Ligand SMILES: [Zn+2]
């Protein structure tokens with residue numbers, strides 16, 4: 296292990312959540328850069344977030360230069376740790392930047408290891424955003440939090456779009472482009488994002504069901520994926536209809552305003 | 553093999569099945585050698601041929617062949633770039 300002894304002493308306590316040892320270690324030590332690594336290639340912050348420890352994650356976030364913050368956010372969103380998500384969103388790195396909204400694949404030059412995982416690639420697909428991942432996992436609290444910050448799933452372009460961006464993404468890694476479209480639609484078709492996304496979500500779900508059925512007929516390779524998403528939308532609509540227990544609510548769902 | 557066949561031929565066949573159930577395991581398949589998808593494909597074919605040959609433990613060998621096929625398909629499923637799909641679909 297290339298790591299030295301002091302940073303190992305730091306990381307063991309950070310992983311196992313011993314608040315005072317980590318606090319004493321990172322307070323005024325000349326060495327012990329917080330961006331150090333571990334046996335599995337992980338980080339102090341990622342080991343702290345992997346096993347829910349709001350205190351350790353907060354005291355690590357106090358440090359100005361901390362690496363792999365976006366990976367920690369995606370790991371917290373993957374789980375139900377809403378407090379850790381709030382803490383990481385309160386970080387000044389997210390506040391004054393566009394990093395939260397746009398995907399890790401196309402956010403910036405990406406020289407910084409903002410969303411990086413161990414060494415080679417991101418934890419999840421490079422197309423998945425924090426909000427798309429929250430919709431995938433169906434975390435209602437996290438979806439609402441990310442929607443408050445203005446992070447919304449961008450509806451993918453039409454299949455036959457010929458804009459310069461879609462053509463450029465089609466030239467290289469057309470498979471990855473199709474996979475990213477499917478991820479965006481699986482995020483949009485999530486009951487969490489459907490309910491918390493917009494006013495009148497039953498009409499949104501019906502229209503998205505129709506759109507996904509048409510794209511299932513068009514693609515014909517990922518037909519089963521799009522049909523599953525269309526069934527998700529149909530089930531959401533039927534579930535919203537089922538909860539009605541007055542005639543006024545039934546009338547409101549059966550015909551709009 | 554002849555000596556092991558003379559006494560306890562049943563135990564010999566059982567030991568062969570145990571060795572193949574160890575080889576066809578996703579753990580040993582992944583951690584055993586470089587390029588494990590080709591290893592799993594070849595082992596799937598070998599286990600299918602031995603299922604046709606034995607005919608007493610046909611179901612055991614068919615289960616192991618299905619294990620190998622499932623491992624190959626699972627490794628293929630995880631691809632999320634076109635380069636990885638191309639690498640799995642054709643070797644080096
Ligand atoms: Zn376009």
Ligand SMILES: [Zn+2]
Nearest residue numbers: 553554555556
């Ligand atoms: Zn022999």
